[PDB]
Amino acid sequence: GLEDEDDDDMEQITAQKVLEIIETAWINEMCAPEILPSQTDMLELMVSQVAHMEEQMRDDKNDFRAVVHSMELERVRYIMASYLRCRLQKIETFTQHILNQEESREPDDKRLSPETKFAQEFASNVDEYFHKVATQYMPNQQRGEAEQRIVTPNLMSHVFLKANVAVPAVIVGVDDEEVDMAAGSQHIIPYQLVADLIQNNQAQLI
Amino acid sequence: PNYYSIEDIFVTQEKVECRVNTKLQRMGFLDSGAESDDLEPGRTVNLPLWYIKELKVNNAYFTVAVPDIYRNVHKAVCEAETTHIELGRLHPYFYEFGRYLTPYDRNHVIGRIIFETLRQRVRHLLDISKSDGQAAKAEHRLDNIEAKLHEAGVRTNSQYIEWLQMT
Amino acid sequence: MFGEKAFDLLKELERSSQTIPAFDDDGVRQVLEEIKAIFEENVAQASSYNASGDRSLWPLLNFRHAALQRNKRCLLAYLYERCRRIKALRWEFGPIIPGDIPEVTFFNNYSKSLAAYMCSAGYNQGLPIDLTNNLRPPKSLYIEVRCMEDYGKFELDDGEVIHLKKNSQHYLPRAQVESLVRQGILHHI
Amino acid sequence: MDPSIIEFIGEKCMISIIPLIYGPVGPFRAGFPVFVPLWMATHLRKQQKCRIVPPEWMDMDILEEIKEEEKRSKFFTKMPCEHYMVVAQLVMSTAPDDVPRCEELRTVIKDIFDIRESKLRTSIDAFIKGEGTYAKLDNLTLLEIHSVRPILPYSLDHIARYQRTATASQRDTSMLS
């Protein structure tokens, strides 16, 4: 009943359009330190939408268009190469206490993805290896997944804001100063206090 | 278990001789043995920090104290002489001593002393813009931390160089 | 002294950057063979009535605790420090070409951990996905190779014999030539 | 932050050119302009297939007027499509194979590129007292801020321990880091 969205639905979402719909979840992770929500919808879209372009290319004889639809397909993928080139890293990095956050709600399709598979391998590779590290008298009080190791809770990595929003002093839920908002300008800020607009995707990132 | 460094036990191993409010007892690695388990309040009382890192300045064990480079005579006029003052490599734990210790001393005066050195970066690295030449011109007047981003300071520009053209 | 020893670690990888002859798991003996040798010191007073609960072990508890504290996270590095640029070349190639020379169990665990990536990658079902070679538009499949003095000789890919250095060149199809880029190879196709 | 993050991006924009793939693009017809993203003119001009003429800001009059317009810009200025540090890179590479006036072009762009950074130290020589919630994009360009993006922000946290800490963290009468 709620059909006719710009996703894969009852319309043609342009190869230049479908370009757009995952652009920000690449760019947020660049200029931001911790996990942002990841959506497994693309495991329908991107595996599929372009694969249907493949079969049309599979129907592969031209000199021009054999490559043209593909030259796209390269450009479509040196992001997706790049995308989880880090997200693999991001929680490999943040194996530490992300279990606590991911045990809060088991965040649904929006936050992580089937990211949860690395969790099982995280402890396995951290235990097995240590089996020949320090095992004669192996750990004594913080013997499990200990408390002290954390990769990246520093939330103040001063972030640039892609102004694409309410220009005037559009004031929102945030603890530091947020005066003097702008559609072109900005007052530069850190991640913690503004973790709201990009869950909303009202505001944006550079 | 920290904001790490490769030298993580060249972290709290710098030594200071802060005095004692109290008598002494068997420092172990010292000439302590069956020889002395007691001395006076105040002595050349060496302090490689790691044992006293959270050992209750407020409690009557040891004293308000400074290593005299960290005393005002350098610092409080190194904030006046914050102009072409040098740091070399001389006391490298000097962005980062005060990131820990200088409150722990409990003289409620010294944290502000620091930054106004490092406030100068907003008007220091105007000179720091670019790379003319070799990998070794004047690369020896650093701290344990500024050098890293300074290399990085070069680095983005060094590959901003290739942003231009084939260069 | 009590583990300030990684200042010695710093030289093992010096030639071993992109001109690596071979690596060593070495230098590790007494930095290892003391560590719980000195637990016996750590256990000398571990829950001992030597002083019956007073100050006098807390300053050296820190010695008891710091001593570990440095041992671990350095010993994170001994694989982690070693996991980093090995992952990088292991990004430059899958296990098409592993190292020219319980780390294999951790590598196999990392290879199984990378599966997650491979599952979504290429398709829903999964493809060990080309990320690091053939920005080639693919041309005809059976023409030979050329290199720039590669070393290690792991090319196990579908060819007669290649002898992987410069002029590793035999009638090698596309299935063979899918290995490496920037480890001494790509002056030429 | 990169040489080609922009070329991931900026060439995605499109312009009408001179010479069907699905897209808003139409089929191709001799003698007949066609708006295309700019990652085909690669594959035409270097393919010795067709030419291309630029957008309108690409001239030595409109931006030989801007040479004084931005002296208003105590903050920022006129921004003709924001991307004239990338397209001009590739345009002036190959476009001047037959295009005229590739020089004052080349002049002004450096005569405006290096300059608006030359202010940028200056405005950055106004930051005082952890002034985190004051900043400037007000009519910023596209291809500049990357050249400071890694440096100070991977500095300021180890400052902002003591700069940004004030407006939610407190100690005794002296200042806190």
Minimum distance, in Å, between the CA of residue C86 and any CA atom of chain A: 14
Closest residue on chain B to C4 (Cα) = B9
DSSP string, chain D: --SSHHHHHGGGSEEEE----SSS-----TT--EEEESSSSHHHHTTTS------SS-SSSSTTTHHHHGGG-SS----SSS-TTTHHHHHHHHGGGT-S--SHHHHHHHHHHHHHHHHHHHHHTS--TT-TT----TT--SSSGGGTTTTSHHHHHHHHTTTTTTTT---SSS---
Please tell me whether residues A66 and A78 are part of one structural domain. Answer: yes
CATH of the domain at A19: 1.20.58.1030
Please tell me whether residues A56 and A79 are part of one structural domain. Answer: yes
Tell which of A104, A129, A151 closes a domain: A151
Distance CA D95, CA A67 (A): 23
Minimum distance, in Å, between the CA of residue D15 and any CA atom of chain B: 23
Please tell me whether residues A145 and A157 are part of one structural domain. Answer: no
Q: Choose among A14, A156, A163: nearest Cβ to D157.
A: A156
Chain B residues whose CB is inside 8 A of the D146 CB are 156, 160
Assess C135–A contact: CB distance below 8 Å, yes or no: yes
Contact D145 A182 (CB under 8 A): no
Tally of CA atoms within 13 A in the half-sphere of B49 that contains its CB: 19
Name residue, tokens 């319309």.
A11
Q: Which of C41, C109, C25 is nearest to C75 (CA)?
A: C25
Q: Choose among B4, B50, B55: nearest Cβ to C66.
A: B50
**Using H for helix, E for strand and C for coil, what is the string for B18-79?**
CCCCCCCCCCCCCCCCCCCCCCCCCCCCCEEHHHHCCCCCCCCCCCCCCCCCCCHHHHHHHC
Contact B108 D2 (CB under 8 A): no
Assess A135–D contact: CB distance below 8 Å, yes or no: no
Q: What's the resolution in A?
A: 4.3
Please tell me whether residues A42 and A142 are part of one structural domain. Answer: yes
Contact D128 B122 (CB under 8 A): yes
Q: Choose among A78, A176, A184: nearest Cβ to D167.
A: A176
What total number of domains does chain A contain? 2
Assess B77–D contact: CB distance below 8 Å, yes or no: no
Question: Which residue in A48, A91, A133, A138 has the most chain C C-beta atoms within 10 A of its own C-beta, making it the best mutation to test that interface?
Answer: A133
Please tell me whether residues A112 and A11 are part of one structural domain. Answer: yes
Contact A136 C36 (CB under 8 A): yes
Please tell me whether residues A7 and A61 are part of one structural domain. Answer: yes
Size of interface A-D (CB pairs under 8 A): 79
3-state secondary structure of C94: coil
Assess A31–C contact: CB distance below 8 Å, yes or no: no
Contact C166, C79 (CB under 8 A): no
Please tell me whether residues A44 and A90 are part of one structural domain. Answer: yes
Contact A74, D7 (CB under 8 A): no
Please tell me whether residues A30 and A112 are part of one structural domain. Answer: yes
Chain C residues whose CB is inside 8 A of the B51 CB are 59-60, 62-63
Which architecture characterizes domain D1-58 according to CATH? Answer: 3-Layer(aba) Sandwich (3.40)
Contact A118 C115 (CB under 8 A): no
CA atoms B142, B146, B148, B154: torsion sign? negative
Minimum distance, in Å, between the CA of residue A12 and any CA atom of chain D: 10
Contact A184 D139 (CB under 8 A): yes
Q: Choose among D2, D155, D171: nearest Cβ to B149.
A: D155
Helix or strand holding residue C31 (H, E): helix C29-33
Helix spans in A42-136 (H): 42-58, 65-75, 77-93, 98-102, 117-128
Please tell me whether residues A61 and A124 are part of one structural domain. Answer: yes
Does A contact C via 3+ CB–CB distances below 8 Å? yes
Q: Dihedral (C-alpha) D156, D161, D165, D166: value to the nearest 10 degrees?
A: -90
Please tell me whether residues A127 and A158 are part of one structural domain. Answer: no
The alpha carbon of residue B110 and the mean position of all alpha carbons in its chain are separated, in whole angstroms, by 13
Please tell me whether residues A116 and A168 are part of one structural domain. Answer: no
Contact D151 B118 (CB under 8 A): no
Chain B residues whose CB is inside 8 A of the C69 CB are 1
Contact B149 D154 (CB under 8 A): yes
Does D contact C via 3+ CB–CB distances below 8 Å? no
Q: Which of A93, A103, A89 is nearest to A152 (CA)?
A: A93
Contact D32, D41 (CB under 8 A): no
Contact D37 A16 (CB under 8 A): yes
3-state secondary structure of A89: helix
Contact C60 B6 (CB under 8 A): no
Distance CA A197, CA A32 (A): 13
Amino acid residing at C146: R
Minimum distance, in Å, between the CA of residue D151 and any CA atom of chain A: 11
3-state secondary structure of B136: coil
Give long-range contacts, CB 8 A cutoff, 24+ apart: C1-10. C2/B9, C2/C63, C2/C66, C2/C67, C2/C70, C3/B9, C3/C31, C3/C35, C3/C67, C3/C70, C3/C71, C3/C74, C4/B9, C4/B10, C5/C31, C5/C74, C6/B6, C6/C74, C6/C77, C7/B7, C9/C74, C9/C77, C9/C81
CATH of the domain at A196: 3.40.5.60
Q: Choose among C56, C58, C62: nearest Cβ to B25.
A: C56
CB atoms within 10 A of CB D171: 12
Assess B154–D contact: CB distance below 8 Å, yes or no: no
CA distances from B139 to A48, A56, B136, D104 (A): 54, 58, 6, 39
Contact A81 C131 (CB under 8 A): yes
Q: Which of C80, C82, C68, C61 is nearest to C34 (CA)?
A: C68
Does B contact C via 3+ CB–CB distances below 8 Å? yes
DSSP string, A42-56: HHHHHHHHHHHHHHH
Q: Dihedral (C-alpha) A122, A127, A130, A134: value to the nearest 10 degrees?
A: 130
Does A contact D via 3+ CB–CB distances below 8 Å? yes
The alpha carbon of residue B42 and the mean position of all alpha carbons in its chain are separated, in whole angstroms, by 24
CA atoms B35, B40, B46, B49: torsion sign? positive
Angle between the A65-75 and A77-93 helix axes, to the nearest 10 degrees? 20
3-state secondary structure of B16: strand
Burial class (CB in 10 A: 0-12, 13-18, 19+), D119: middle
CA atoms A83, A84, A87, A89: torsion sign? negative
Domain map of chain D by residue range? 1-58, 59-177
Assess D168–A contact: CB distance below 8 Å, yes or no: yes
Which residues span the domain enclosing A51? 1-151
Distance CA A12, CA A6 (A): 8
**Using H for helix, E for strand and C for coil, what is the string for C41-54?**
HHHHCCCCCCCCCC
Chain B residues whose CB is inside 8 A of the C66 CB are 9, 50
Tally of CA atoms within 13 A in the half-sphere of C150 that contains its CB: 27
Look up residue B72 and give its two tokens: 């005002």
**D-contacting residues of A 104-123, CB under 8 Å?**
none
Please tell me whether residues A137 and A171 are part of one structural domain. Answer: no
Minimum distance, in Å, between the CA of residue B71 and any CA atom of chain D: 17
Name residue, tokens 């962005």.
B95
The alpha carbon of residue A80 and the mean position of all alpha carbons in its chain are separated, in whole angstroms, by 11
